[PDB]
Amino acid sequence: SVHIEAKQGEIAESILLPGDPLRAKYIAETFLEDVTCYNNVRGMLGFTGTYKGKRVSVQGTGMGVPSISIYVNELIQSYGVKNLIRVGTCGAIQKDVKVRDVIIAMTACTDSNMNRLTFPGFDFAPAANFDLLKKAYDAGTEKGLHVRVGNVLTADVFYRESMDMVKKLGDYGVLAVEMETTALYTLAAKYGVNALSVLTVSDHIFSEERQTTFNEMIEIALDAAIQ
Amino acid sequence: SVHIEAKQGEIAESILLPGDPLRAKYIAETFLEDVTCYNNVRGMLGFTGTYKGKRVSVQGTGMGVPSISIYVNELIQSYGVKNLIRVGTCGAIQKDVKVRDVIIAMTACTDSNMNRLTFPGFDFAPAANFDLLKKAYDAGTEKGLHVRVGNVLTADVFYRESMDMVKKLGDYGVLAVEMETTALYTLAAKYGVNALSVLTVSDHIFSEERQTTFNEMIEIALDAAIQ
Amino acid sequence: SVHIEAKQGEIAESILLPGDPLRAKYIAETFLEDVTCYNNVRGMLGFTGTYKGKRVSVQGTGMGVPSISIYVNELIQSYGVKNLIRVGTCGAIQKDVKVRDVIIAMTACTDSNMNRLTFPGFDFAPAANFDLLKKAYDAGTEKGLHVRVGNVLTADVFYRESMDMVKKLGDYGVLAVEMETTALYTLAAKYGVNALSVLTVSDHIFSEERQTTFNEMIEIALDAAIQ
Amino acid sequence: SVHIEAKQGEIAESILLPGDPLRAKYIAETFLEDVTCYNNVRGMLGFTGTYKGKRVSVQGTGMGVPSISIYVNELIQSYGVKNLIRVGTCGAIQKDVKVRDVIIAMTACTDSNMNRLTFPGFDFAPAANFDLLKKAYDAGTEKGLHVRVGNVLTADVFYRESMDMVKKLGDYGVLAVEMETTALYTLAAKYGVNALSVLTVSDHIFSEERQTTFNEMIEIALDAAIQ
Amino acid sequence: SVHIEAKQGEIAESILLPGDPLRAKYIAETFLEDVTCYNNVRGMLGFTGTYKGKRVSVQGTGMGVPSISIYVNELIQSYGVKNLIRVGTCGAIQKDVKVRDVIIAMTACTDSNMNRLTFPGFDFAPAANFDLLKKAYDAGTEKGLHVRVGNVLTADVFYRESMDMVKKLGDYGVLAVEMETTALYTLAAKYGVNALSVLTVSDHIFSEERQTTFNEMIEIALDAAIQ
Amino acid sequence: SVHIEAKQGEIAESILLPGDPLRAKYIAETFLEDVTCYNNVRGMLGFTGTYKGKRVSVQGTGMGVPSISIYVNELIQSYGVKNLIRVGTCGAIQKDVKVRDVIIAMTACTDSNMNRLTFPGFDFAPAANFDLLKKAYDAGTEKGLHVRVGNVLTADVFYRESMDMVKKLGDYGVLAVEMETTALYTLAAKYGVNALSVLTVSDHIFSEERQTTFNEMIEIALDAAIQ
């Protein structure tokens, strides 16, 4: 495809989607066997290998709705990908959310215009695939993680001049802020495929220090993927 | 309160919220014991009684975001209600959704302006309480119902001149259209209380004939409430 | 129709539209002769009878743009109704407006999205039928009422977190806030029929205690209707 | 003021506001006695004289919301003007509106952003002063004119690429299109003064040939002004 | 055309566009030879004459996007005009911009809705013709003027209740506020013709006293026009 | 900073900003001497070296407004960068724009919401620094390149369902589509620093095959930077 140099068939139907391509490399090296690298265009590493005997891929997305939209469109439309699980970081914005919590996004709020363009006059609420959500939730519960299922903010603007609205969203239960989920969930819904975002809380708005938790999160995402 | 003539303490902390006040009367008569009627202002019947020994209420909301917002604000702010479960009807707009399916709304899209006023520049995605959602889903699964967990449209406009956008939403996986969930979920989040919408599919866009399914739905909503 | 169980011909071409269905019952019992009740679906009482020898109806609408839109669409499109007069309550938001004043809405402002959907990029100003307006104004003047003809706000949100905008509207002469007029006036214009809203001021933002004034208002609305 | 070179006291408290400054000159020459010209800045002629013994002014406004807003702000804030009556032309957009009809605007729709800036999230419906409206309506009725009281569109865009929305507005009863009323009515409301627009229909979208009708219109506007 | 009484061929392909028609008269009298006046409709004077032997026109536009849009549409579509240079005034809103500076607008911000109607969901940035821009910049540099090339605000609202946003725009480098450029640049782009705005700073937000600078500006605009 | 692991002083005050970090590596290897790599966080390579004896940096930005905003905010606020020149690719959307043309963006249109959040009710037109623009234009003219100075679209959505609006923008002279310029220009203006985007046309909507042109573009960007 335009931004992925893989041949047809090189990318598995289930894929993990970190924002950081170097985390894709870490995931492939740490968890997968029989690994190949199918992409290095723009340094946006993608790998395919096996986990517990099942073929799976891991693909960096970059940061922000426009970047992840490119990769997700290409993966779905050009490579036949069916199960897409973002594995990322986020910043807590609700008072009771703690560093190293795992957040499974049911839905996402956004300051992006991407859905207002598509659905003028409407507020589109992008929704997780419930099947994947339940699988990841059950896996994380079994593994003994602090898992929080709820709402997140997908932000275009990492550095805001005013945080009043972000605080207000936290007052309405929005758990954390990240930069991808609205696009992943919307595009998966568009194409009738299955998406989920699983996030580790890395800081509070108002990699080795979370490597163990991060590993456990990757494990439940892979678990939900290989089912 | 302004629209509810109940004394303090007369309304239980868990409440079912049909749109039709006559369905509130039906629910009270059919399922509850030791029933009283605490409201008839505007004919918007509300009742309190016991179910499997636990005190619960049932309150009509009327149709539309503005009507349900009035009742939900008063219930939460004036009567200390903590668990609110809408039990309603909806019209299918996604091709695979069938009449008599039960839909548990994870989130809701809307053509209402109510959240754009509160969060200018943002798309707010109102989210169910996951705890209640899981309880209702597990109850409906155990009971052998066709339960679908996903996205719904909360519409201001029942009679639209153009259905192009509603069709487009169905193409993005939105299951059905109803007229309340955005407000219930948003207000519950605002006040830190717990909400869910459970809906029976009554027709396809493109009461006795569903009384058995409707009863089973009321049963899982009560089950999720009394836990 | 979907929400009205009347047979063809049971609803008169002129109709009064209180928000409260119990006020429809009061109006029918107090003012009309040879009364029948043609609807009790959702408790939304509707009646037909005679006033000064002329056949007229009275139909509850519920609260809010979405609720009244349902009823008005059905009345116009399924029952051939031609003259529709809302008879309601409102809250004063302009300093000189007093409790028990009668307000005849020339037009309405709104926080609803219903007209932005229909006319993207435009501000639609819903207008009363001038003929009905003049008839009601002349009747109220003759009857010796305090009648104020002007602008109102049709609100989706009865309980607002911030009242800054409502105050600002009052500073621009908007008289009072209610929850229906934008929809009534817009739909009547759409279908080429005649609408008016006549309102009693029940409180100031910043039923027996107004029963005499309320009666006098019902009288001028009926007068404007039977002409 | 910035755009009017008049001394304090030179402009009367009642003023007619044609868009065309040469029509201000025509009105002054044809109807007024003891006339002076108080402004020629930007050629935007303004005059003061007497009509039926009462002092009145006539001031060009130019075309469009931004131009008339300048003049109306200055007249109200710097010159103490209290009664402002636009006397203009318009193009019919509703099928039953005829050339040479006189339209008295109750309210105005707009494609301008001027009120969305002031009232974010709201649709502001600018309203005529009813007192002036009634006076002009009664005068025009007595004079035997075809007077139509209703809604108009205040357009920013005289030459539109697509007229679909203008046609749709006509289908919702909007009578004609002009380029000033939203601003006049909004600013008059802001400052607690009295405004009206009286318009002659000059063409149908889909000066000597209307000089007699135009004169009769000027006469009723002056009549409403001198009361 | 509707607002210009010129015959075909009477208006030159290059035209200067002051807002003030009396400045059009000044320009024609001061700079042009063999002058005729081709329009006085609405007092909006237009002239054609010769400058350094080349035929050129000068046409008032009035104030505001809607007024200039009318004239520019007619000039382009009915009179075949190809090079359009606004020569106007502006108010400084950025701290380093001085009275009598000449500002050449690269682009313009706006509070107008005119481009949101045409490009829903997009921010359209109207751009100068670079060829004309370079010619005017080089001419002004040669002439020894203080020329500033940058961003301006095209305002609908000359008298704003709050100047917070205007100050914020100045903090983002927007140089000055005026009332025409967005429309001129957008319409020229629509029709594939060439536009520029050259402005003299007349005051700071937070004719003889600038007649020399104003003349020098007219000179560089004519220079850019006759090339 | 959060996304750049450089020490204070390691990044030069003038920087080139390709979207592709591997193009940053190419630029450093091909054009710069005495090179170090100061960042590999997220694979987003950044380098500092010397060009014609002057210290300069080159930093990947990733794709899309949110990604480039992160890097530009950090470069300006944490590293004291003063001159920022994007060197990127774009797709032609105006009929006369050719592959391998160099486009220097005067301004940018966008489908992003980033400026509507900051300037509610306004269209913000992000503007290039004219000084840098002129330097790059003069350098490209001297070098004999096809340089086009004009408007571009900064898109969030690379894969659009409907291209109607993109075509319409091309009809209004918008030259090409890319995914960064609005953010670069807006943030540079916010902080009072200097930005420009220079783009090579890589395809038409409706790396070695452009390596020579791409090199020439890098050369003029470096030229404009080292002045």
Side-chain angles (χ1 to χ4, degrees), chain A residues 1-6 8-207 209-227, chain B residues 1-6 8-207 209-227, chain C residues 1-6 8-207 209-227, chain D residues 1-6 8-207 209-227, chain E residues 1-6 8-207 209-227, chain F residues 1-6 8-207 209-227:
Chain A
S1 59
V2 171
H3 303 85
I4 308 174
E5 66 187 325
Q8 289 303 280
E10 286 185 340
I11 307 186
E13 284 188 341
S14 297
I15 194 163
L16 270 57
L17 296 176
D20 181 355
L22 301 184
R23 286 303 223 179
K25 178 180 176 79
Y26 172 83
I27 290 164
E29 287 173 349
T30 300
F31 293 96
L32 306 184
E33 302 182 355
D34 298 334
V35 174
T36 49
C37 176
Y38 63 71
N39 186 57
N40 193 40
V41 172
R42 295 167 177 273
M44 197 62 74
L45 297 171
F47 302 89
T48 301
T50 71
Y51 182 70
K52 291 183 176 174
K54 297 298 285 192
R55 197 156 158 275
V56 65
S57 294
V58 60
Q59 172 65 58
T61 65
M63 301 181 291
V65 156
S67 185
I68 184 167
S69 293
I70 281 165
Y71 292 102
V72 168
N73 269 293
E74 294 182 13
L75 290 164
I76 293 173
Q77 297 190 248
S78 291
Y79 293 99
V81 175
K82 304 299 178 197
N83 302 290
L84 305 96
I85 305 187
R86 161 164 162 72
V87 285
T89 64
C90 67
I93 60 166
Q94 196 281 330
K95 54 184 185 169
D96 307 315
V97 176
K98 318 298 195 303
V99 171
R100 286 170 288 271
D101 287 352
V102 173
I103 291 173
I104 300 177
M106 294 169 71
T107 187
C109 303
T110 193
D111 60 2
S112 175
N113 196 39
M114 65 163 273
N115 286 328
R116 295 199 179 169
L117 294 167
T118 305
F119 308 101
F122 290 74
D123 297 6
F124 184 78
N129 177 257
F130 183 69
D131 179 66
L132 287 179
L133 185 150
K134 177 175 161 48
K135 286 168 174 172
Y137 174 76
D138 290 340
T141 296
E142 182 64 3
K143 215 154 184 79
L145 299 172
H146 280 289
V147 182
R148 298 285 302 272
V149 180
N151 209 344
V152 300
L153 169 64
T154 297
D156 278 354
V157 183
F158 187 90
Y159 294 109
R160 274 184 220 278
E161 187 62 30
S162 170
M163 293 290 287
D164 284 355
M165 205 56 29
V166 178
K167 292 178 179 171
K168 194 176 191 178
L169 289 162
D171 291 338
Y172 279 69
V174 180
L175 301 175
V177 62
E178 53 98 75
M179 298 182 68
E180 290 81 17
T181 293
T182 292
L184 172 61
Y185 286 8
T186 299
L187 290 167
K190 184 180 176 178
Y191 289 116
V193 298
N194 309 315
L196 190 67
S197 288
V198 184
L199 308 163
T200 295
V201 178
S202 48
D203 70 337
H204 201 112
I205 285 212
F206 317 106
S207 69
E209 293 183 359
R210 59 184 184 266
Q211 180 174 341
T212 298
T213 295
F214 179 69
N215 282 346
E216 292 180 281
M217 187 172 98
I218 297 312
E219 289 160 6
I220 75 179
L222 286 167
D223 293 342
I226 64 178
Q227 286 184 58
Chain B
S1 59
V2 171
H3 303 85
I4 308 174
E5 66 187 325
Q8 289 303 280
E10 286 185 340
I11 307 186
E13 284 188 341
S14 297
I15 194 163
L16 270 57
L17 296 176
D20 181 355
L22 301 184
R23 286 303 223 179
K25 178 180 176 79
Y26 172 83
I27 290 164
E29 287 173 349
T30 300
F31 293 96
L32 306 184
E33 302 182 355
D34 298 334
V35 174
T36 49
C37 176
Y38 63 71
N39 186 57
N40 193 40
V41 172
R42 295 167 177 273
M44 197 62 74
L45 297 171
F47 302 89
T48 301
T50 71
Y51 182 70
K52 291 183 176 174
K54 297 298 285 192
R55 197 156 158 275
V56 65
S57 294
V58 60
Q59 172 65 58
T61 65
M63 301 181 291
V65 156
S67 185
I68 184 167
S69 293
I70 281 165
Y71 292 102
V72 168
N73 269 293
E74 294 182 13
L75 290 164
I76 293 173
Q77 297 190 248
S78 291
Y79 293 99
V81 175
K82 304 299 178 197
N83 302 290
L84 305 96
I85 305 187
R86 161 164 162 72
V87 285
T89 64
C90 67
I93 60 166
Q94 196 281 330
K95 54 184 185 169
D96 307 315
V97 176
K98 318 298 195 303
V99 171
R100 286 170 288 271
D101 287 352
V102 173
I103 291 173
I104 300 177
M106 294 169 71
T107 187
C109 303
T110 193
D111 60 2
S112 175
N113 196 39
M114 65 163 273
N115 286 328
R116 295 199 179 169
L117 294 167
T118 305
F119 308 101
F122 290 74
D123 297 6
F124 184 78
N129 177 257
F130 183 69
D131 179 66
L132 287 179
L133 185 150
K134 177 175 161 48
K135 286 168 174 172
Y137 174 76
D138 290 340
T141 296
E142 182 64 3
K143 215 154 184 79
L145 299 172
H146 280 289
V147 182
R148 298 285 302 272
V149 180
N151 209 344
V152 300
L153 169 64
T154 297
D156 278 354
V157 183
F158 187 90
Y159 294 109
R160 274 184 220 278
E161 187 62 30
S162 170
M163 293 290 286
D164 284 355
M165 205 56 29
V166 178
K167 292 178 179 171
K168 194 176 191 178
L169 289 162
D171 291 338
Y172 279 69
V174 180
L175 301 175
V177 62
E178 53 98 75
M179 298 182 68
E180 290 81 17
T181 293
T182 292
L184 172 61
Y185 286 8
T186 299
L187 290 167
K190 184 180 176 178
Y191 289 116
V193 298
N194 309 315
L196 190 67
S197 288
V198 184
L199 308 163
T200 295
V201 178
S202 48
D203 70 337
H204 201 112
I205 285 212
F206 317 106
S207 69
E209 293 183 359
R210 59 184 184 266
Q211 180 174 341
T212 298
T213 295
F214 179 69
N215 282 346
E216 292 180 281
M217 187 172 98
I218 297 312
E219 289 160 6
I220 75 179
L222 286 167
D223 293 342
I226 64 178
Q227 286 184 58
Chain C
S1 59
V2 171
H3 303 85
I4 308 174
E5 66 187 325
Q8 289 303 280
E10 286 185 340
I11 307 186
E13 284 188 341
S14 297
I15 194 163
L16 270 57
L17 296 176
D20 181 355
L22 301 184
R23 286 303 223 179
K25 178 180 176 79
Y26 172 83
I27 290 164
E29 287 173 349
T30 300
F31 293 96
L32 306 184
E33 302 182 355
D34 298 334
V35 174
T36 49
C37 176
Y38 63 71
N39 186 57
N40 193 40
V41 172
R42 295 167 177 273
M44 197 62 74
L45 297 171
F47 302 89
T48 301
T50 71
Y51 182 70
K52 291 183 176 174
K54 297 298 285 192
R55 197 156 158 275
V56 65
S57 294
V58 60
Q59 172 65 58
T61 65
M63 301 181 291
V65 156
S67 185
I68 184 167
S69 293
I70 281 165
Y71 292 102
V72 168
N73 269 293
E74 294 182 13
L75 290 164
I76 293 173
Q77 297 190 248
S78 291
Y79 293 99
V81 175
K82 304 299 178 197
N83 302 290
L84 305 96
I85 305 187
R86 161 164 162 72
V87 285
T89 64
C90 67
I93 60 166
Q94 196 281 330
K95 54 184 185 169
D96 307 315
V97 176
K98 318 298 195 303
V99 171
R100 286 170 288 271
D101 287 352
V102 173
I103 291 173
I104 300 177
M106 294 169 71
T107 187
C109 303
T110 193
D111 60 2
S112 175
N113 196 39
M114 65 163 273
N115 286 328
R116 295 199 179 169
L117 294 167
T118 305
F119 308 101
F122 290 74
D123 297 6
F124 184 78
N129 177 257
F130 183 69
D131 179 66
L132 287 179
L133 185 150
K134 177 175 161 48
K135 286 168 174 172
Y137 174 76
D138 290 340
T141 296
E142 182 64 3
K143 215 154 184 79
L145 299 172
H146 280 289
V147 182
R148 298 285 302 272
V149 180
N151 209 344
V152 300
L153 169 64
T154 297
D156 278 354
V157 183
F158 187 90
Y159 294 109
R160 274 184 220 278
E161 187 62 30
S162 170
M163 293 290 287
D164 284 355
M165 205 56 29
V166 178
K167 292 178 179 171
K168 194 176 191 178
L169 289 162
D171 291 338
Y172 279 69
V174 180
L175 301 175
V177 62
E178 53 98 75
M179 298 182 68
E180 290 81 17
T181 293
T182 292
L184 172 61
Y185 286 8
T186 299
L187 290 167
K190 184 180 176 178
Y191 289 116
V193 298
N194 309 315
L196 190 67
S197 288
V198 184
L199 308 163
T200 295
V201 178
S202 48
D203 70 337
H204 201 112
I205 285 212
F206 317 106
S207 69
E209 293 183 359
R210 59 184 184 266
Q211 180 174 341
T212 298
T213 295
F214 179 69
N215 282 346
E216 292 180 281
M217 187 172 98
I218 297 312
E219 289 160 6
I220 75 179
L222 286 167
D223 293 342
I226 64 178
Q227 286 184 58
Chain D
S1 59
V2 171
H3 303 85
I4 308 174
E5 66 187 325
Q8 289 303 280
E10 286 185 340
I11 307 186
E13 284 188 341
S14 297
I15 194 163
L16 270 57
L17 296 176
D20 181 355
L22 301 184
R23 286 303 223 179
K25 178 180 176 79
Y26 172 83
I27 290 164
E29 287 173 349
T30 300
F31 293 96
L32 306 184
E33 302 182 355
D34 298 334
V35 174
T36 49
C37 176
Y38 63 71
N39 186 57
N40 193 40
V41 172
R42 295 167 177 273
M44 197 62 74
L45 297 171
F47 302 89
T48 301
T50 71
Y51 182 70
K52 291 183 176 174
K54 297 298 285 192
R55 197 156 158 275
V56 65
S57 294
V58 60
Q59 172 65 58
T61 65
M63 301 181 291
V65 156
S67 185
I68 184 167
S69 293
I70 281 165
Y71 292 102
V72 168
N73 269 293
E74 294 182 13
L75 290 164
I76 293 173
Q77 297 190 248
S78 291
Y79 293 99
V81 175
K82 304 299 178 197
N83 302 290
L84 305 96
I85 305 187
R86 161 164 162 72
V87 285
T89 64
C90 67
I93 60 166
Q94 196 281 330
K95 54 184 185 169
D96 307 315
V97 176
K98 318 298 195 303
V99 171
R100 286 170 288 271
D101 287 352
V102 173
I103 291 173
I104 300 177
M106 294 169 71
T107 187
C109 303
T110 193
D111 60 2
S112 175
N113 196 39
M114 65 163 273
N115 286 328
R116 295 199 179 169
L117 294 167
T118 305
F119 308 101
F122 290 74
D123 297 6
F124 184 78
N129 177 257
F130 183 69
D131 179 66
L132 287 179
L133 185 150
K134 177 175 161 48
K135 286 168 174 172
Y137 174 76
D138 290 340
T141 296
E142 182 64 3
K143 215 154 184 79
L145 299 172
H146 280 289
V147 182
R148 298 285 302 272
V149 180
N151 209 344
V152 300
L153 169 64
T154 297
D156 278 354
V157 183
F158 187 90
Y159 294 109
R160 274 184 220 278
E161 187 62 30
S162 170
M163 293 290 286
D164 284 355
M165 205 56 29
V166 178
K167 292 178 179 171
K168 194 176 191 178
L169 289 162
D171 291 338
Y172 279 69
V174 180
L175 301 175
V177 62
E178 53 98 75
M179 298 182 68
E180 290 81 17
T181 293
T182 292
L184 172 61
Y185 286 8
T186 299
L187 290 167
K190 184 180 176 178
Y191 289 116
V193 298
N194 309 315
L196 190 67
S197 288
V198 184
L199 308 163
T200 295
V201 178
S202 48
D203 70 337
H204 201 112
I205 285 212
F206 317 106
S207 69
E209 293 183 359
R210 59 184 184 266
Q211 180 174 341
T212 298
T213 295
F214 179 69
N215 282 346
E216 292 180 281
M217 187 172 98
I218 297 312
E219 289 160 6
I220 75 179
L222 286 167
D223 293 342
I226 64 178
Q227 286 184 58
Chain E
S1 59
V2 171
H3 303 85
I4 308 174
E5 66 187 325
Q8 289 303 280
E10 286 185 340
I11 307 186
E13 284 188 341
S14 297
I15 194 163
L16 270 57
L17 296 176
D20 181 355
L22 301 184
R23 286 303 223 179
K25 178 180 176 79
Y26 172 83
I27 290 164
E29 287 173 349
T30 300
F31 293 96
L32 306 184
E33 302 182 355
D34 298 334
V35 174
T36 49
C37 176
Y38 63 71
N39 186 57
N40 193 40
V41 172
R42 295 167 177 273
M44 197 62 74
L45 297 171
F47 302 89
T48 301
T50 71
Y51 182 70
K52 291 183 176 174
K54 297 298 285 192
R55 197 156 158 275
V56 65
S57 294
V58 60
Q59 172 65 58
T61 65
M63 301 181 291
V65 156
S67 185
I68 184 167
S69 293
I70 281 165
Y71 292 102
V72 168
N73 269 293
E74 294 182 13
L75 290 164
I76 293 173
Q77 297 190 248
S78 291
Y79 293 99
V81 175
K82 304 299 178 197
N83 302 290
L84 305 96
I85 305 187
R86 161 164 162 72
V87 285
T89 64
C90 67
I93 60 166
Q94 196 281 330
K95 54 184 185 169
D96 307 315
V97 176
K98 318 298 195 303
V99 171
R100 286 170 288 271
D101 287 352
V102 173
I103 291 173
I104 300 177
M106 294 169 71
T107 187
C109 303
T110 193
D111 60 2
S112 175
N113 196 39
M114 65 163 273
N115 286 328
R116 295 199 179 169
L117 294 167
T118 305
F119 308 101
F122 290 74
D123 297 6
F124 184 78
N129 177 257
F130 183 69
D131 179 66
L132 287 179
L133 185 150
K134 177 175 161 48
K135 286 168 174 172
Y137 174 76
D138 290 340
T141 296
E142 182 64 3
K143 215 154 184 79
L145 299 172
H146 280 289
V147 182
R148 298 285 302 272
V149 180
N151 209 344
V152 300
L153 169 64
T154 297
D156 278 354
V157 183
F158 187 90
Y159 294 109
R160 274 184 220 278
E161 187 62 30
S162 170
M163 293 290 286
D164 284 355
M165 205 56 29
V166 178
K167 292 178 179 171
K168 194 176 191 178
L169 289 162
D171 291 338
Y172 279 69
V174 180
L175 301 175
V177 62
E178 53 98 75
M179 298 182 68
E180 290 81 17
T181 293
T182 292
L184 172 61
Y185 286 8
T186 299
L187 290 167
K190 184 180 176 178
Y191 289 116
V193 298
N194 309 315
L196 190 67
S197 288
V198 184
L199 308 163
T200 295
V201 178
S202 48
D203 70 337
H204 201 112
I205 285 212
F206 317 106
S207 69
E209 293 183 359
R210 59 184 184 266
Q211 180 174 341
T212 298
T213 295
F214 179 69
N215 282 346
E216 292 180 281
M217 187 172 98
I218 297 312
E219 289 160 6
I220 75 179
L222 286 167
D223 293 342
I226 64 178
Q227 286 184 58
Chain F
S1 59
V2 171
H3 303 85
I4 308 174
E5 66 187 325
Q8 289 303 280
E10 286 185 340
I11 307 186
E13 284 188 341
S14 297
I15 194 163
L16 270 57
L17 296 176
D20 181 355
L22 301 184
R23 286 303 223 179
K25 178 180 176 79
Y26 172 83
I27 290 164
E29 287 173 349
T30 300
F31 293 96
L32 306 184
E33 302 182 355
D34 298 334
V35 174
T36 49
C37 176
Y38 63 71
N39 186 57
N40 193 40
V41 172
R42 295 167 177 273
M44 197 62 74
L45 297 171
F47 302 89
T48 301
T50 71
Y51 182 70
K52 291 183 176 174
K54 297 298 285 192
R55 197 156 158 275
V56 65
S57 294
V58 60
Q59 172 65 58
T61 65
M63 301 181 291
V65 156
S67 185
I68 184 167
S69 293
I70 281 165
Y71 292 102
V72 168
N73 269 293
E74 294 182 13
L75 290 164
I76 293 173
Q77 297 190 248
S78 291
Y79 293 99
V81 175
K82 304 299 178 197
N83 302 290
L84 305 96
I85 305 187
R86 161 164 162 72
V87 285
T89 64
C90 67
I93 60 166
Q94 196 281 330
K95 54 184 185 169
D96 307 315
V97 176
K98 318 298 195 303
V99 171
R100 286 170 288 271
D101 287 352
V102 173
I103 291 173
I104 300 177
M106 294 169 71
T107 187
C109 303
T110 193
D111 60 2
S112 175
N113 196 39
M114 65 163 273
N115 286 328
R116 295 199 179 169
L117 294 167
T118 305
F119 308 101
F122 290 74
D123 297 6
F124 184 78
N129 177 257
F130 183 69
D131 179 66
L132 287 179
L133 185 150
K134 177 175 161 48
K135 286 168 174 172
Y137 174 76
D138 290 340
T141 296
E142 182 64 3
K143 215 154 184 79
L145 299 172
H146 280 289
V147 182
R148 298 285 302 272
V149 180
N151 209 344
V152 300
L153 169 64
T154 297
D156 278 354
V157 183
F158 187 90
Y159 294 109
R160 274 184 220 278
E161 187 62 30
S162 170
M163 293 290 287
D164 284 355
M165 205 56 29
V166 178
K167 292 178 179 171
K168 194 176 191 178
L169 289 162
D171 291 338
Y172 279 69
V174 180
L175 301 175
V177 62
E178 53 98 75
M179 298 182 68
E180 290 81 17
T181 293
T182 292
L184 172 61
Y185 286 8
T186 299
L187 290 167
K190 184 180 176 178
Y191 289 116
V193 298
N194 309 315
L196 190 67
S197 288
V198 184
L199 308 163
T200 295
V201 178
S202 48
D203 70 337
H204 201 112
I205 285 212
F206 317 106
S207 69
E209 293 183 359
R210 59 184 184 266
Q211 180 174 341
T212 298
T213 295
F214 179 69
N215 282 346
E216 292 180 281
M217 187 172 98
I218 297 312
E219 289 160 6
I220 75 179
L222 286 167
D223 293 342
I226 64 178
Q227 286 184 58

